[PDB]
Structure formats: C-alpha cells, structure tokens
RNA sequence: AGAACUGGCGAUGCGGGAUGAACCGAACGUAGAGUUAAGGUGCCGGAAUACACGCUCAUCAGACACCACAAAAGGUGUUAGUUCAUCUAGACAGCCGGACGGUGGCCAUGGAAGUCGGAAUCCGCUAAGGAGUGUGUAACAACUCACCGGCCGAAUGAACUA
RNA sequence: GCAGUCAAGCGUUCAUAGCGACAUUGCUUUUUGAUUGAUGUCGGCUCUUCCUAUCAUACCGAAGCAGAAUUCGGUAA
RNA sequence: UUUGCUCCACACAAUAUAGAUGGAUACGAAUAAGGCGUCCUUGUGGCGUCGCUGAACCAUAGCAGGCUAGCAACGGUGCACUUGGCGGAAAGGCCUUGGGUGCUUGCUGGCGAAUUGCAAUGUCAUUUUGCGUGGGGAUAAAUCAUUUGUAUACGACUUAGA
C-alpha cells in the first residue's frame, strides 16, 4: 500500500522472491530491493557454482560481445532471475521493469527508510531445516565479483549508526511508555478501554 | 476419497432345483455404494468363477465405527499387486476409526509402493487389543507412560505479500 | 561460580493435558484439550466447555497454548469437564495478553461509526494530557 | 573447473514418435511370441 | 593469427597512454609519486661491464642498445581525492 | 526409523564448567578455555545438574542422529582438552642424511622448520597452530611432543609435519626418512 | 513382411499438447450472457506459492514419449515390507580369559613343527578348542579366528521384495 | 561362434513340460622361439573453431619401483 | 546579436503524466531461538514480561474546512529566520538552539452554509516550457578557413597563429 516498497533481500530464496517482485512490478507496485549480496539459493553452493559455470561458457561464438553477458554482482543476478520472469521485450514489460530497483548494501536513501521482508520466499519458512544453501555474496565473489569487501565495510559502518540510532529510540520509546502508564488510570483511558483502544 | 466400510452379502443366481445358495458376505472400504459393489463382484469373481449375472446382491450396509472417538491400534493385513508377483504386506496403523486407518492405508501404498485403490485388497482389520502385541516400532514408540514432544520450528502462515518484521519460528 | 550453564528452550509440548486454541474449521477461535496423542500429527482434542466435539484433529489445525492441566489419558468428554473446570483453564485463559488481544481485536470490528469518531475523540484529549506530561517530564 | 556440455531434455518430435512406435512395436511382439 | 588479448586493433583514444594500474600502496614507506612523464628522445648504444654470476659473459663486457627520455622536472599543480564505492 | 527422540549424555567432572548459549559451546577446566561453534548441527542442549548435560535430537533422521554422537563426542574432546590435555610424540628417523629441525620466529610467529631431509637445500617450515607448544624431548633421540588442549589443533600439526617430509618419486620399502607420530596421549599420565 | 476389417487425413476452420501431417478435445451463420471439454492454476500467463498423507537431495535430479532403448546388474544412500533365525536357563558390538593331548600325523625336501607342496582329515578330554582362518620365522616361536566363558544390559542378525 | 558341462536364478507353483547370468574341450596348429599392405575419386596445402577417447608438458596412485630408466592407472584440453 | 545569459518572487499561459488522493512508520543478529523491562557479584547472568500477525502505530472533527467570544494549560504543530552539530555508498538528508509569527478539536459558547435542485473526477497532485513584472549576479568559447606531422583512404588525430 505504500508508494515504494523496500525489500530486505537478506535470507530470501532468489527464485521465489523473483517471482513476488515480477509479479507486484507488474501490477504498478514500485519495489526497491537492497541487501542483494544476503540472497540464499537452495542447494549445495558447488551446485550453484557449477550452474552459474554452465551459463558462464554460453556464449556467442563468432561475437563474444553479442552473446549473453554474465553479469557477476548479487543484485545482477537476482535481477536476471526476474527480467526472467517478466515479459521484458514488449513496452509493458519494459514499463514493469522500470519501476524496479536492486542495490548491494543499503546506500542512501534507503538506510533511513523501513525495509519489509516477503514471507513466502523467507529460507527460515520455505527451506526444510537440515537442507544445504548457497548466499549469493560468496557465490559472486567465486565467480569474479570484487567489491564484496566494500560493501562489507561500508555495511559495517552502516551498522553502527543505525544501532546508536536504534538506542536512542529505544529510550524515547520507554519515557512515551512511561508516560502512558501513568495515564491509564483516567476517566478517558477506561472509555477508551471499553471501545477497545 | 472420504472412504466408508460397507457390509456386502451376494449369492448366486436361483434356479430350479437350485434353492439356498452359498451366501457370501465382505467388508468393502469404498467412497459409494456403486464402488462397492463394483469391487464385491470383482472380489467374487476372483475368490471363485461367479460371474455377475451369474450372482445376486441381497444386502449392503453402511457400517459405523462402534467407538468412533477412541483411540486404537489397527492391525492391517493386505495383499496388493505389482509388475511382479502379488505380495502380502502387515502394517499397524494408530487411528480413531477403521475407515480412517484404510485411508491412511491407501494413502501409504500410493506413496511407498505405488500402488493404487485397484491394486489393494484388504484382507482383515483388527484392532489389538494388548500393547505388548504391536510389532512395529513406528507405532509403538507413542505408547509411552506421559509422552510428551515439542514442535520445533513452527512455520506461521502470512495472508499479505509483505511482512513488517523478521519472522520467528518458536512455539 | 563453578555451576555450568546451559540455556534451555520453553518449548510447548504436545501432551496429554495440554490446552489448545482451534485456528480453523467450525470451532475456530475455541479452547479444546489434548486427551490423546494419534500420532506425530493428530492428537484427539476435546473442547466441552466451548462446544468443541471430541475429535481427531491434525496438529496443524490447531496452535498450542501455554496452559496445561493435569488430564489422564483417554478421558471421556465428562471428565474432561470436570478436570477443566476444577483446573480453572477459562479463567487462565482469559487473564493473557493473548485473550485479550483477541477480545481487542473482535470489540474494534465491532465498533459503530460513532463510536470510532467517539474513539477519536478520546484519543485527541488523553494525548493533550500525555503530550503535556511528556514535555514536563 | 572446466564446466562440460550436458545434454538436452528437451525431447523432440521425431524421437517422442518414433519411441511411441517402438512401444506399439513391443507389445504386439510381446502378444505373438506369447502366443508361441 | 595474433594475440587475442590486444584486441580490438582500434586506435588509441590519446596520443598520452593511461596508466591503468599504479603499485600497491604501503603505509609505513615515505611519500613517493609512482609515476613520470617523459619525451622520448633517439636511442644509442653503450658498453656494459657485465657482472653476471653464472653466465658466459660474466667479467665481460657486451654492447646494447638504449632509449634516452628526456625528463625535466614536473610541476604539481594539483591534488583529487578517490572514494571506494560498491561501484 | 524416524524416531520421536533420541539423547546422548556429556558427563562433566568436578572441575570444569560448561557454558552453552544458542550452540556455541565454552569449557572452561583447570587448564584454560576452549570455544566450538556448533551451529551447524541442529540440536537442543539440556542439564539436570552440574555434572551431566543431555543432547537430543526431536524428529530426526538417520543423518540427524548421525550427528547427534559427533556433537556429544566433540563436547567430550573439548572436557578432556581443558582436565588432561594431549601430548603427541613424533620420531623423525633417517638413513644417511640427518635431519634437523628446529623452532624458529620467522615474521613474529612460530614455525618448525626441518633441514636436510634426504639432502634437501630446501628448508620446510611448518606453522605452529596457536595453543599447541612444541618441545624435543630429554633422553630420548630425535623425538619432538606437540602438547595442547585441543586435540583438533595437535593432531593437525602433528599431520603437516608428517605430511611435509614426504618422500617423492622414490621407493617407500627402500627410503624410510620422515617424521612419524609414535605416539598420542594425554598431557597426564599417572598410571 | 502378406492379407482382411474399422477408423483418422484428403475437401477442415476452432480449444489444448511452448512449437508441428497423422496426439488430446470439439466440427464452424452474426452477436450477448452463462457453463464446460481437453489442458492447466509460482512468474512469464487467465486460474489455490490450496488443503492432506508419504517419498526423494542428483559433482549438470526430476517435472516423458513407459506396461520402450541403454536395463543385466552394481551401491557401507534412504524408506517400507516377506521369510528365516539367535535372545535375560543373556541377543548384537566390544574388552579380558581359554583356544588342550597323540602330534613336530603321513610322503617327498637343506629345513617345512596348523599356515611353499599331494591324500583320507582320525582318536581322547572337553564350557570349548580345525591334523587349522591369516599375518608372521630359515625352522620355531608370537599374535590371530573357528569355538566356549566372565564382564554390563536389550533386542539383534541374514537372505530376499518393492 | 559352434555344440556342450552343471546351474545364480527364472519358467501359470511345477528341477530332465522349458528357459537361463556368471564360469570350463577345438580353431589359422604346430611346441623347445624355424621364416611365414590396401586405396582412384579422392589427396593435397592453408587455416579457424570445438571434443577428449591425453602423444608431450603439470600433479598424483600402484608395481622387485634399489638408483636410473620404464610399465599400468587417476585428475587434467 | 537592438537588455543578450543566469538564480530568486508573483502572474498568467501552454505541456503531458506506465498513473498522489492521510503517513515508504529506519537496530543488528538468531530461528533447536529472540524482543522489551528490571536487578546484581556485569555475564553465554537472575527475575519478570511479550509474540500466536500491520486486524498495528501515528494521524484523523471545522466553507476541501469560514468569521468571532471565552476557559484551562505554557503543551502540540506549521511558516519565514537563527544557533550548534552530524551524514560521502548514490552524502542532497537527520538532529538540535533562540526569538518572532499564526493555528490549536484539551473544554464551553455565538453567527455562516440551502439553489450543484435525487448522482455525474465534479477539477485541490506534480513535470516541463514560454511570456510579464521586481530582487540580485557573471561579462566565454567552439567550428570552418590557414598551419604541423608524433596522425592520416575520406573523416578523424595532433601542433601553431592578435
């Protein structure tokens, strides 16, 4: 329901989240999605190395510059996994595709904003626990990524401000709860009790 | 589907000269009466050469479980076929009601063996009455003084697209 | 200061005894009680009090509840009464924040259009107050 | 890690009927060497 | 035919061939430029007295070719500062 | 079978602690500190009291007991590291050329560098993993102890100074040269 | 391959099988509303990321032509079964004991003592102990397993079927 | 390959109604280690790319592999 | 080049919008675990409490929101300014200081609304481009042509020239 939506794309499965994404940019939902290097794939990661390595040697043979380009960054791949799902050659689908965003990290003006997860492509609520996976971090870096480092460090600094960020609201929140309960006690709190709120 | 034991008796077909036949009776687990009686004439015929013209249903009985909220161990003789030969199989199956451990029976054969509603004959269901006479450990093992197991990892059904907070999987 | 530690998980049990809240079917929303463990996934629940029938029910229908009392095995729906009503479970039911979000959750469905303008009015006045304690303190 | 070729299940139309005439072909046999 | 690493044979985009990798960087060491700018002016030939253990023509002297670049000094006239980014 | 539980015991002695919180798993004996990271396993950790711990696997498979055992082995090795410790005694032998092995400080840290292992001008250094001490043993020839609390960390030193003097294209009936470890123990031995 | 029958196609559009001579539905005036066939319902793409019980993890699974070819089997993967068995007058696994006497049986060998070789493989005492299951010595010896006992306590093993 | 030999198993259950995996006579053939090439409408060069069923180079495993040299095998284009 | 160019304000035009119609409302990590509160001998600590959906939270009354009289409190909030910081991943935003200026539905009053005729988006958002006013600001280059040869099929490239 909100003009932009936010996905944390950490700890979700590519496929299915693809599959959300495609559908909800198709139906006129601007979607933005960060953290792409925290992706899960289900399967062993020499599994999905190996395929990742089939589609490394598909290309063009008389061209190498017109074949298939392998993008090799976290948020390329995942967003191959849904240009996949999207009809992308008609104006529609490039219309669907503009209203997307995928990032690594969480840049500005992102950072600030309230990121949402998708449920149903959750590893935590899909995945059966015992089963293997791949992070998609580690699986561009074996293929030939290079900035996984600084998006570490500057998603480390990240951190930091956020959680000084976090401890400040957290002791704005107990003084606002404090004051309601010295409130709770009043003619206008028990209405409110009685009309449920 | 939603299965229902039914009693069947047959008999041959009178004649002159011919009175008071062999009257067979079977229990058949099926979802209607139609099937039913279709699976008591295939069963006949294959028990002795009693062609359907050459038989009469006299009677079919819808029968309710005695104790349907009860508790109770079931032992299930069956015989089923295959590309190979035919092969009798004994299972034990824990449930409230003989229709309930037929279905879950049907259910078992179709994911372990393959094997179909067609396939399945069911020779006897019998409940034990004795805990020490189970065999299987699958089912003995919850016939222990205060059992009790935990759930772990509980997985809570989203109705919208997006959820606003991390999910936690505990009960 | 030579005690180990090891932290345990207050995992709720399927067990004999233990309350159960029916999320689905025709008794949704409704207390029931774990007479009998079926198997890994059905337990044979009986809910006399709120008009549950004593049945089989997949372990997925229902959510397990942190209420227990003490039940024998196999009880009839009689003595399941009786034990639920000297165990007090409505009463500790309704004493949880679970229960009365629930309640909180049907009285909002419930309100009229006056009363949530009434609502909004209630709310404009207790923030004044609270907005004024807030700054004062 | 020189990844291989792997081969295709993408079944064509020449191969899905000609393996239907073989099956027909098998069984017919089947009934006549039965018969004998 | 030919090295399919220096492809495309296009011509170069400058007459001033960029440098596209200087050496790493260490900390602790003084503060040193990596590079310098010279014209290259002819070459000529010298003679070496080669003082190379092992081989045929150590304690010998051999005559080889070389490039003289004429360097007058640089002025530094100015300084940017890089950023590291995800990009 | 797929059975509904199944346990494994971890008997602790009178002078260790054992602190576990969300499977990471500290044991603290008379000897020091060690610390594994179990979260790979899927296991529930119990105590009844201060001298046993249960480890139970709900609902699990073959694989899932499987390593259930491993789990309780491993906090076993971790409380026997922190009371007794493990000594490992290599002997390092040769025919013509002796060896010699020392341990140097090359770049601030510890190596067991060997010398003239069948005549080699190649010197092998061999890192000393962090919490085994290396030392050569009184009265005895050509014997080296790694002793540690970690049984994981001395076994695998005592592995890459075996592995490291290999004897290439050669027959191994004839060139016996190497270091092999004679023996494992504990770093007491009363009896 | 030779016959006979009956269908399909030819003169034939439409739905489906991504695609198509012989596959699955259905035959056609122009329109509106409703319901369906075959086939489907993550996204492409209209339609349940429905509900339920099981199985499977593939270092290029599978999503099919199959009551077809590679296909006869191999596997210390996993599940469920059938028939044999042993078992608290003690099962499986482990430790520790015993593992004896003629006798170093008989023939060729420098030697060969259970264990380089060829022939029956015997008799006694036994809880139990092969004229020996392997390593091992020049021959021995030593260990070992076949078998029996003590130890603690509880089900275990083998062969087949899917 | 031919005939066999018994059968691991199978054959509507059926041992020589009948099949049948895996294993065992004789061949150009005589012993002591003697004398006893095809291809005509294809073929050249150059030259690109691909496969691996690897000749060489790299790393390993085994073998009376002492050393040297070699043999067989594994990964590997 | 007959005040050309550019940044502010109001004042009207034209433009076209992959699609405003209360608010995109900020810890991190784990999930066989966590969040919040409290306490201590300060940690993998003790106790309490929470989840089981955002069904929330905040906002939210007034001509699409007018004009006035008071009460209580000195809070909430907007606008033009100001203080002091902080943020470089794409910072372009967050927080704070002080005074001024409005509103206040926290409470009580007093006037207005009609006729859009029983509904008709019934026009309230923001991109850009021009024209007019009054408030300021700054006073270049490139190309051809000529020329060089470190370049060159032509283009292109590279030199030089008040």
């Not at chain 2, 015929?45 to 005695?66: D, T, Y």
């Not at chain 3, 949704?28 to 008009?51: C, F, H, M, S, Y």
């Amino acid at each position: 329901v909100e003009p932009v939506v936010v996905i944390d794309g950490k700890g979700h499965l590519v496929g299915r989240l693809a599959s959300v994404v495609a559908k909800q940019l198709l139906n006129g939902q601007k979607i933005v999605v960060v953290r792409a290097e925290e992706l899960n794939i289900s399967g062993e990661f020499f599994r999905n190395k190996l395929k990742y390595h089939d589609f490394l040697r598909k290309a063009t043979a008389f061209n190498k510059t017109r074949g298939p380009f392998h993008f090799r960054a976290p948020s390329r791949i995942f967003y191959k996994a849904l240009r996949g799902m999207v009809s992308h050659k008609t104006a529609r689908g490039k219309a669907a595709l503009e209203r997307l965003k995928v990032f690594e990290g969480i840049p500005p003006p992102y950072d600030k904003k309230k990121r949402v997860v998708v449920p149903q492509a959750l590893r935590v609520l899909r995945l059966k626990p015992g089963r293997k996976y791949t992070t998609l971090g580690k699986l561009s870096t074996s293929v030939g990524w290079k900035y996984e480092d600084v998006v570490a460090k500057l998603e480390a600094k990240r951190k930091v401000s956020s959680a000084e960020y976090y401890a400040k609201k957290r002791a704005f929140t107990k003084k606002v709860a404090s004051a309601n309960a010295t409130a709770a006690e009043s003619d206008v709190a028990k209405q409110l009790a009685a009309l449920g709120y | 589907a939603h299965f229902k034991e039914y009693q069947v008796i047959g008999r041959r077909l009178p004649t002159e000269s011919v009175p008071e036949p062999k009257l067979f009776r079977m229990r058949i687990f099926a979802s209607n009466e139609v099937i039913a009686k279709s699976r008591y004439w295939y069963f006949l015929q294959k028990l002795h050469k009693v062609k359907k013209a050459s038989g009469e249903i006299v009677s079919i009985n819808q029968i309710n479980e005695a104790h349907p909220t009860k508790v109770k161990n079931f032992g299930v003789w069956v015989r089923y076929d295959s590309r190979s030969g035919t092969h009798n199989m004994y299972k034990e199956i824990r449930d409230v009601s003989r229709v309930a451990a037929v279905e879950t029976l049907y259910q078992d054969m179709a994911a372990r063996h393959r094997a179909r509603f067609r396939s399945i004959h069911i020779l006897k269901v019998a409940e034990i009455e004795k805990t020490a006479d189970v065999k299987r450990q699958y089912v003995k093992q919850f016939l222990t003084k205060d059992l009790k197991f935990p759930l772990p990892h509980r997985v809570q059904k989203s109705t919208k697209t997006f959820s606003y907070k991390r999910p936690s999987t505990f009960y | 200061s030579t005690d180990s530690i090891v932290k345990a998980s207050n995992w709720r049990l399927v067990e004999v005894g233990r309350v159960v809240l029916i999320k689905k079917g025709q008794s949704a929303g409704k207390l029931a009680a774990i007479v009998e463990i079926i198997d890994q996934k059905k337990v044979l629940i009986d809910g006399p009090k709120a008009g549950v029938p004593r049945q089989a029910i997949n372990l997925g229908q229902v959510v397990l509840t942190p209420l227990t009392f003490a039940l024998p095995r196999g009880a009839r729906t009689a003595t399941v009464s009786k034990k639920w009503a000297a165990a007090a479970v409505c009463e500790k039911w309704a004493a949880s924040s679970w229960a009365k979000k629930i309640a909180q959750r049907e009285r909002r469905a419930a309100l009229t259009d006056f009363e949530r303008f009434q609502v909004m009015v209630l709310r404009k006045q207790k923030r004044y107050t609270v907005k004024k304690a807030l700054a004062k303190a | 890690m020189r990844v291989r070729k792997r081969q295709s299940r993408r079944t064509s139309t020449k191969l899905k009927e000609g393996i239907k005439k073989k099956a027909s072909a098998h069984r017919k046999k089947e009934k006549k060497m039965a018969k004998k | 035919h030919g090295h399919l690493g220096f492809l495309p044979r296009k011509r170069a985009a400058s007459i001033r061939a960029r440098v596209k990798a200087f050496p790493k960087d260490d900390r602790s060491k003084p503060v040193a430029l990596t590079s310098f700018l010279g014209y290259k002016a002819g070459m000529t030939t010298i003679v070496r007295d080669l003082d190379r253990p092992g081989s045929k023509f150590h304690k010998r002297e051999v005559v080889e070719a070389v490039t003289v670049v004429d360097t007058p000094p640089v002025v530094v006239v100015g300084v940017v500062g890089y950023v590291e980014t995800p990009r | 079978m797929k059975y509904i539980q199944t346990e494994q015991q971890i008997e602790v002695p009178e002078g260790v602690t054992v602190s576990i919180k969300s499977r990471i798993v500290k044991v603290v004996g008379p000897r020091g500190t060690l610390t594994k990271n179990l979260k790979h396993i899927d296991v529930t950790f119990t105590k009844v009291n201060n001298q046993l711990i249960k480890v139970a696997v709900h609902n699990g498979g073959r694989k899932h007991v499987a390593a259930l055992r491993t789990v309780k082995s491993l906090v076993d090795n971790m409380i026997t590291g922190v009371t007794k410790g493990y000594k490992y005694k290599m002997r390092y032998v040769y025919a013509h050329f002796p060896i010699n092995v020392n341990i140097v400080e090359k770049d601030g840290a510890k190596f067991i560098e060997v010398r003239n292992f069948l005549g080699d001008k190649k010197i092998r250094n061999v890192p000393v993993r962090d919490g085994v001490t290396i030392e050569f043993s009184t009265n005895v020839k050509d014997e080296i102890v790694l002793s540690g609390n970690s049984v994981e960390d001395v076994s695998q030193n005592a592995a890459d100074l075996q592995q490291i003097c290999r004897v290439r294209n050669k027959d191994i009936r004839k060139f016996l040269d190497g270091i092999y470890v004679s023996h494992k123990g504990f770093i007491t031995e009363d009896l």
